[model samples]
Target: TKEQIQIIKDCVPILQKNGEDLTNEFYKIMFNDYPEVKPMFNMEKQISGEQPKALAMAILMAAKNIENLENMRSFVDKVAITHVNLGVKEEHYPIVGACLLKAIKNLLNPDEATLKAWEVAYGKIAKFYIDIEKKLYDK
Candidate 1:
């Protein structure tokens, strides 16, 4: 678990430097690994648009202040709503998680400690998605 987190956080630097590219890479990794999720993401809109940059910014902010992410709850809630609107299913999360981890790993020099932190942080976020998904969809 900790190992995964480390990999997750390991991406912040790369994300900061070239977030759009990394987000594109992240989406590519996800679609390639799990083609089923292709429809969930509007490739044309995300890549050729603004979401990637916004997402990269979010990733950097989230990573930089994960421990004291004061706005995390609201952000997550809004994301949950958006995911629901987008028809994001539960299984999509693993793909998201994997690609997200890979995205960070692409940038950072992830050591054991940072990797663990990422794993823990990712777990927290993933769990929130899993927990609120049903309720979000219901609403």
Candidate 2:
């Protein structure tokens, strides 16, 4: 997992440069590939370019803190709460995950190992969110 963490961190540079565009590609692909998620996104934010901007920052945060991220439970909790408010559930993460991975591959064409690292890292993070959302849903 150390290697994977490094690979995830390795993405920071690429993400820093193409982060916004990458997210735009992600949402575009997600919208086209998985239409069910489209209505959940606000057109205003997308049009204003705020949504991908925010996600890009979040991606940077993840790249920087992937290893110690759990130490910041409050930030993670905030996201779970926000996601619940948006009607997000465990079901949606995989759909978004696939789209995101596709976006990364499409844009960067990263090597196999790097791609594998992201797959592992994203799944770990998604699991974290999914677990927290489950608890909130029960409340």
Question: TM-score of every model?
Answer: 0.74, 0.93
User: Could you list the CA RMSD of all candidates, in the order they appear?
Assistant: 3.7, 1.2
Locate the minimum summed-lDDT window of 10 residues in model 1. Answer: 1-10
Q: Compose the digit string of candidate 1's lDDT tens values, residues 55-133.
A: 7776777776565555566776777777888888777777687787787677554666665566577666676666777
Cα lDDT for residue 105, model 1? 74
**Where does candidate 2 stray beyond 4 Å?**
none
Using TM-score as the measure, the top candidate is: 2
RMSD of 1: 3.7
RMSD of 2: 1.2
- Candidate 1 total steric clashes: 7
TM value for model 1:
0.74
For candidate 2, give the lDDT of residue 40: 84
